[PDB]
Enzyme design. Sequence first.
Site, PDB file in Angstrom:
ATOM      1  N   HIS A  41      24.077  18.298  16.996  1.00  0.00           N
ATOM      2  CA  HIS A  41      23.985  17.297  15.892  1.00  0.00           C
ATOM      3  C   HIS A  41      24.119  15.831  16.370  1.00  0.00           C
ATOM      4  O   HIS A  41      23.836  14.918  15.557  1.00  0.00           O
ATOM      5  CB  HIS A  41      24.926  17.707  14.756  1.00  0.00           C
ATOM      6  N   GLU A  72      24.685  25.285  18.574  1.00  0.00           N
ATOM      7  CA  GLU A  72      25.246  23.924  18.349  1.00  0.00           C
ATOM      8  C   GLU A  72      25.672  23.287  19.685  1.00  0.00           C
ATOM      9  O   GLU A  72      26.282  22.224  19.644  1.00  0.00           O
ATOM     10  CB  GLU A  72      26.396  24.011  17.343  1.00  0.00           C
ATOM     11  N   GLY A 146      35.088  12.048  13.922  1.00  0.00           N
ATOM     12  CA  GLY A 146      35.399  11.377  15.206  1.00  0.00           C
ATOM     13  C   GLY A 146      35.800  12.345  16.331  1.00  0.00           C
ATOM     14  O   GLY A 146      35.949  11.881  17.473  1.00  0.00           O
ATOM     15  N   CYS A 148      34.133  15.405  17.097  1.00  0.00           N
ATOM     16  CA  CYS A 148      33.028  16.278  17.563  1.00  0.00           C
ATOM     17  C   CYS A 148      32.842  16.048  19.060  1.00  0.00           C
ATOM     18  O   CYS A 148      32.911  14.861  19.499  1.00  0.00           O
ATOM     19  CB  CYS A 148      31.736  16.045  16.785  1.00  0.00           C
TER      20      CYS A 148
END
Length: 182
Positions: A41, A72, A146, A148
């Site tokens: 992402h 991911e 904040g 990730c």
Amino acid sequence: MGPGFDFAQAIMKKNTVIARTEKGEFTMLGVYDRVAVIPTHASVGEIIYINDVETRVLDACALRDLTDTNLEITIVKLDRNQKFRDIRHFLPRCEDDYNDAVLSVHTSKFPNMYIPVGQVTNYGFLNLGGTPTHRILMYNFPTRAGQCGGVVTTTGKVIGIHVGGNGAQGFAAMLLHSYFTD
Ligand SMILES: C[C@H]1CN(c2ncccc2F)CC(=O)N1
């Protein structure tokens, strides 16, 4: 404070950089040579900022399992003049549960942040921001924006990277030894 934070600190001081994309600032784990991971992402492009230096991206691969489901994890190769310490031997070989994990973050906003998140479940399937995602780890800590790319460690193992939460829990994409075989 204890041997959990000791191991986490060792990884953060040598194997992390601050990655900036058009989707924000992320903790980025360097694994070996010029190869690093980041949540998919983050939307890595042709150019990325690494500790505020403009860096060409030589390759980027959004991992999917063999059911063709999102993992991911984006593996990135950086046009950087310096190699990472090789930490592939700290990666687990199998999907597993864990006790007493630390989530470690280093950004401009959250420098030198270490969170004792406790027990880590092999959660498996998660609908993450509307995307079917496999191999998710879950911990019962109310993680925030904040974090990730945050690194999830036990003593002796780097097990995953933080990819999201629901206000009560946080979720990490597994890291496996097989992702970085060369
Ligand atoms: C800097 C900001 C972050 N914070 C958090 N609160 C709850 C869950 C996760 C957190 F990171 C504690 C704090 O003093 N404010």
